[PDB]
Write an enzyme that holds these catalytic residues in place. Structure first.
Site, short mmCIF file in Angstrom:
data_model
loop_
_atom_site.label_atom_id
_atom_site.label_comp_id
_atom_site.label_asym_id
_atom_site.label_seq_id
_atom_site.Cartn_x
_atom_site.Cartn_y
_atom_site.Cartn_z
N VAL A 1 0.81 -1.21 0.00
CA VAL A 1 0.00 0.00 0.00
C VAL A 1 0.85 1.27 0.00
CG1 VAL A 1 -1.82 1.25 1.20
CG2 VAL A 1 -1.76 -1.26 1.26
N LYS A 2 0.64 2.12 -1.00
CA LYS A 2 1.38 3.36 -1.11
C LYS A 2 0.52 4.51 -0.58
CE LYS A 2 2.54 4.72 -5.32
NZ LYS A 2 3.32 4.60 -6.59
#
EC number: 2.2.1.2
Lengths: 211, 211, 211, 211, 211, 211, 211, 211, 211
Positions: G91-92
């Site tokens: 997850v960015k």
């Protein structure tokens, strides 16, 4: 930095001369021999003088000629005979005791002396002190015995710079293109090299693809 | 860098002078005595001056002669006597309180003074401040007590360079060839060494092999 | 850093051993010869081994003994003999093509080898690669030809560390106290020196006045 | 870095001991003489022992006591007597040839030795080699002759680190606050200093105004 | 590097803790007073304790509380009471003779001590030697007198690393964002700052333009 | 650093193997043809296979053999055939896209791959990422282009060290002794060079004068 | 240094994964929009997740999925969804306050977070302190405003090595081959770049000439 | 550092010229064709001449015009023609054996030569020794093959500085803003770049919000 | 380094100028707005000029006045009027394309220009190329976004020195004393700061206790 050709081949010399980058030439007995051997002529004093004179005319710059005598007195006599060949001839002497004695006399007479066979900054210092016009340390031969030829050149150039000596330094015994760059970056006055190395200098892959 | 001989032997002085690299000589009673012993001559006050005069004429350069007095006034008297022997004579004084007073008086009278027995940058600065023409730090004797003599020289040279002082530096107590190279790389003006070291400077296996 | 004596004199060895700082001894034929010269006794093959045995007993640490042969086979035979004299014996071989062959064979047989006469990092690398237990570069001899002996030691020690080679370095050809300090600071495992240098290491003016 | 007091004054020792930063004490015949003088007490063989014991109990760490003899055998005798005074006692010896002989013998019997009066890395090395537990170079006295005391400490600390030697380094002859910092930054194990200096350590303008 | 908040404001602490980057809190009387003043609350022991305990419960990390006494025995009593209010509490003492005395006792009893008002490496060293778990040099205040606060930090950090001291370093008196970065690169263990600075840390044009 | 020969001549391989310093051999088609020309033998598949086994048996270490295909499939097939010649055989592939593909496949089957013709650190990184056991930067060919080859090796080795990659570095295109020294100092695992250079490695005038 | 592709093209991913050098992929909304666009496929939460999962299976390593929510609460929910797509999903999140809050919660749940849009060491530090598994500074965007992007990377890596943080660094915004090299040399764990730069890494005239 | 435009577009030239930061313009056959195409005219001999002449007059600085021949003589004939067009025209030659011969002739005739397609300092030195007025290393193309273009600029500038050569350095193959900064910091005399790059020189976030 | 005041307050200017250390003043719309607010007067073209004229007469050195236009023509017109107010006036323009066009014309008329809002060396360079007499980088704003302001000043100063550009560097956005020391040590020609910082410049606890 001025570039010199370490050869006696008038053909090699004329080629680099045309490039417009040749400042001088350095020879020795073995190089002059190969010249005549590779040509249709025998090496006689008469021929020797004519070949050196022809090189001086071609290059239009200083040309070093080596003495072969081992004693100072004979070295001086020989140096004078070489210098009498053409006003552009620089007399090359080995950096030894006798060579030192000979250097003092010849230079005191106005004859330019190139002290060669130098492998230490101390040798270069004595030569400069004796009146040498040029000092020629051997980069390649130092590498041959596993020491850094480049560091020999560095110490000599740095010493000559901090001591403000007039002598000029000739990076000799050039074996590859980076020997030239190194000498240039270090501040050498001249680099003398074989024709093959000189021919390599100008080569680069990105250049060709750009043409 | 100018090269000096630390001896009183005319034979030695003559040999190196013939190389054309001898810029001067520094002596002391010990050295003059020895030279006189190696010969069959009595060392009389007159034969002394005559000897110093012979060295001056032979080297044709500055020659240091040491005073023996310990008191300022006596040092000055002795100094005037020494300088009168020949105009190339440089008076060498110990760097002590009295040496300082004498150095001040002698330099004012136009007599060049070599301040010796210098083992720290501070002593070199004081001597320089007193009018000294030369300061002589001892590299070897420092290495002798396990400290780096080359670092001594470094501080003295850098200080003088940073401080823009007129004084010239003589690296003395030279024990080997690298002491000479170091002094030269650092920027020392002069290096004075015994005959044996001077004879070692030219030696390198690759030069012999190249011959 | 362990300190070794380069001599064959039991008297010199006894003195330094008393100090409690002697870790080993390095000898060569000349030193052993001189040893029997000073005293009254012919240098026979049986007394020679008797002397080395005695040395081994006095120091209680490794004693290097020099091979004389110039060809591998003879070097191996002579090495086995020296190693059989006493378990503290380390066989010293010249770093040449033959010495390299002999080194491979003696080390494969569990005999400790000291490769000497080393003047470049490349020679030390080959020796280590050949199975040498020790490598002995000569500092003073390099200084003798105007090059930095300490810088040879540096290059050798740095290569050994960066390469994680097992071989130990012995700083040889020690001429003055700073050769010792520089070897210690650089990381040499051992420094072998003459009795005169060993005797100079403790000297310092401040210690004298301090007492 | 552990902090020691170079004194014999119980009053001084007590004050610092209470800050909780006192790890040990170093003394000498002078400092003990001044202690007794200040207390108008005759220095007997019985009082001396009790005073050292008192110091040992107060600091609760190692206490260095100086032998007076000059000869090895005598240094050992006195060394044993000193050590028998109290188990915290570390015997201090001058770093000389006899000192080295005494160091090997006392350290061999389990007694800890502090080798002092060290002014060169070489002396420190020989001491470490002889079995010293502590090595004490004098920074201030080196500064007294215009040399950098911190460089002496630097070389000694570096040598010990590089050689991976067991010995501990006591930065001595501390004269001002920065000596302590430098010693701490260089890597010294111990710094012994006089009370007056210890007091300066925690003083700073911004600290007081901050309060 | 762990981040701390220099405040006693529960709302400030709560906002930052929400980010998940809060490791601890440092408070002082003036800070606590302003927090109590924000409300109409009276500053009394039980309320004070209840408030610090609330801080602890909220941060979930060490919390520094400042002693006010100026005498060690009093500092000790105050330290014990402070430590008793909660297990995350670290007793903060001024780096002075009395503070050092108190540090020794409190730390010997298992209470964590934070020596503050540190402006030199020597103070930090004395604090570390007294038993401190943390040392808090004031970068900002040093820059106020035109000196380099970062250099204070660097020397303390280097000394701690070199000396292997257990103590942790808190970069205190943090005035701006680069102070945090500067302290992170210099190797400080912790950085305590006001809420205003914490809210400046993640600001940057390109990040906003990238949103 | 391990020493390899870049040749296919058994006579050369046997000479250096006897020194006890040969760790492996690297070959290419042109080197193989020359070796067969010199022995005056027909170069058939069978003789080729027998020749390679002869090399493997004489060196007793890794031997690189080059694939001549430039498509991944043909490269893999050819690599399998070369690997099947002898268990000491390492497959050499050109660092290109196809080469990367073949390298992945061959290394995944237990065949060790030497990626060659590398002139940038990025090529070295890809090769390593693809599964190369060795990467071979060419030092001499870079110098021929007037760029510093030793610098290429530097960037590769540093990157490899910094990124903690297991791939071993083979310094190739060795033209002189300093390439070997430089590669060893940088931390390269292996240096592969022609026989003439290997032979020059031991040469030094001081060693000969010492014999 | 692991190499990543910044794209959503399964064809590009397959080509590079075939070299055996692809360690992961980084995606973003606009990038996936192109992939579907080029294929004329319609965007649907069903297809989206099906595509990202396709990436995951292909690459066989970490895959970065950009979160578009600007509020912590929404970022977390959206993050849990992306993480559910495939176990390789990373997850960015933007490095802002909300980002930090989301990063803390998501990472606490065992979900790897990539904090992007980082342009300062302080941001990186906050992100790591908040539980980030990766931080992604942008070199090219910094060079875009006449500042050295490499220097930003340098500070981020230095700080991380100095502070012994676990977070891995992803050099993002790679524009040319030296970006990769520089990132590798500085010590970045990963470098993510577009397919076009990947196809440039192997290019070099000498490689072609060598074949 | 003077700034040049690498174009043949009078519009672009006029824009940047208005900024007052345009010192010259570099052109090539390609850029000329694209200017005439966009314009609407077909380049003829006189059209070509009036255009280059217009550029000169517009920029009010030197303008580079590329030769097309490959043989010395032809390059000279063509060079003489370009020079005749206007006195601001600088002839641009490829650094090759032929280019060198051409450069030597042309430069002797007072015409200024720009030697281009330079990728090594050795090429730059030969150009300079041939009489070149400008040398143009290509930074970008070097970065393309994964090498540092700045390193090549750095060696050419250092060499020209140390050797006190007349020649001026033109940093070519400028791709991004930082190439400009780097060229300037490295001491390049001139940087020639495309219009699109000038357009980014002035951009910065803080400047934007500054307004 | 010449010191400047960033204000319009004649009172403040009068105090610092009394110290004898004021060399100029820097103003802006805001600053003059508060000078006229605190005072009893409105801002009219007559009041403005007259006021600035007073500042000029008071400082005795350059006074920078910022234009408010946004187009080259509007800036030039407005610039001409400002320089007409007094000969000491320096017209401050923003570093943009329009500002550059303006700078070119103005400076070409003999008006001293001060380019501001510079956050990159490229901007400073274009400015310098446009005729600016002063360039002004903002250290503080840069520190604000977590970058090092000194680094920008450093690059601008390094560039100007190397390129030997006439322009003078005014260090702006000074938030504290060390900014002044840092700007001085870096080599800025001028440092402009607010009255408050000035009043903090000579603060020091030791000076106080020294009184």
């Amino acid at each position: 930095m001025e570039l010199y050709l370490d050869t006696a081949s008038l053909e090699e010399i004329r080629e680099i001369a045309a490039w417009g980058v040749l400042s001088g030439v350095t020879t020795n007995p073995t190089l002059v021999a190969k010249a005549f051997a590779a040509k249709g002529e025998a090496l006689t004093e008469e021929a020797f003088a004519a070949h050196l004179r022809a090189i001086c005319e071609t290059v239009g710059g200083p040309v070093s000629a080596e003495v072969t005598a081992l004693e100072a007195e004979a070295m001086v006599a020989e140096g004078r005979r070489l210098a009498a060949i053409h006003p552009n001839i620089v007399v090359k002497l080995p950096t030894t005791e006798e060579g030192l004695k000979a250097c003092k006399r010849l230079s005191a007479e106005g004859i330019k002396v190139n002290m060669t066979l130098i492998f230490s900054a101390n040798q270069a210092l004595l030569a400069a002190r004796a009146g040498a016009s040029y000092v020629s340390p051997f980069l390649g031969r130092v590498d041959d015995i596993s020491w850094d030829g480049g560091e020999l050149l560095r110490e000599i150039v740095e010493m000559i710079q901090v001591q403000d000596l007039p002598v000029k330094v000739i990076a000799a015994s050039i074996r590859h293109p980076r020997h030239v760059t190194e000498a240039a970056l270090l501040g050498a006055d001249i680099a003398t090299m074989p024709h093959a190395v000189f021919k390599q200098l100008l080569k680069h892959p990105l250049t060709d693809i750009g043409l």
